[PDB]
């Protein structure tokens, strides 16, 4: 690795990670599951009704958005969503011990996973959680690859799985 390559891990963090996995969109759109989404992976609602999505948006942003937000607003909502995922892990009796056992990079993969799936979804992966806590990285990754989360939308989840396997940022290089 060159001097530059060694600097790359200092540029990666949970925000940069999710930004890559979720993209950045300033207008309401449907995600790979067809759910109304905006900004950096902010799920507005699972309802097929666009009007409900716009309603949620104005509530989340605090103004009359008509389905459109600014980059700054996307960033604010994103920061709020990341904080929620972190708080969701730390207050959970099942997730917290696993999180604590992980290295810094895998902790990012953990926050990412909860950001995407929510606390109860992740906390339900009994086997994966045990494997991670036991440092069985290959087995954890293989089992994550069986999940509906990954299989229904592989491009959004693939880098997270790789990160759980390796504990490095390699999956986020060379976009």
From Swiss-Prot:
Keyword set, alphabetical order: Antimicrobial, Bacteriolytic enzyme, Cytolysis, Glycosidase, Host cell lysis by virus, Host cytoplasm, Hydrolase, Viral release from host cell
Molecular functions (GO terms): lysozyme activity
Disulfide bonds, paired cysteine numbers: none
Annotated catalysed reactions: Hydrolysis of (1->4)-beta-linkages between N-acetylmuramic acid and N-acetyl-D-glucosamine residues in a peptidoglycan and between N-acetyl-D-glucosamine residues in chitodextrins
GO cellular component assignments: host cell cytoplasm
Record: active site: 22 (proton donor/acceptor), 31 (proton donor/acceptor)
Family: Belongs to the glycosyl hydrolase 24 family.
HAMAP family: ENDOLYSIN_T4
Protein name: Endolysin
The organism of origin for this protein: Enterobacteria phage T4 (Bacteriophage T4)
Gene designation per UniProt: E
């Amino acid at each position: 690795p060159t001097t530059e390559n060694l600097y790359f891990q200092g540029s990666m963090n949970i925000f940069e990670m999710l930004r890559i996995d979720e993209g950045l969109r300033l207008k309401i759109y449907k995600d790979c599951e067809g759910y109304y989404t905006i900004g950096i992976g902010h799920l507005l609602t699972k309802s097929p009704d666009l009007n409900a999505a716009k309603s949620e948006l104005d509530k989340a942003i605090g103004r009359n958005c008509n389905g459109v937000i600014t980059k700054d607003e996307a960033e604010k909502l994103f920061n709020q969503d990341v904080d929620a995922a972190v708080r969701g892990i730390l207050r959970n009796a099942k997730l917290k011990p696993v999180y604590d056992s992980l290295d810094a990079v895998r902790r990012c993969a953990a926050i990412n996973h909860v950001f995407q799936m929510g606390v109860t979804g992740v906390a339900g992966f009994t086997n994966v959680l045990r494997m991670l806590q036991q440092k069985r990285w290959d087995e954890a990754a293989v089992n994550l690859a069986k999940s509906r989360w990954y299989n229904q939308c592989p491009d959004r989840a693939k880098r997270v799985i790789t990160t759980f396997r390796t504990g490095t940022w390699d999956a986020y290089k060379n976009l």
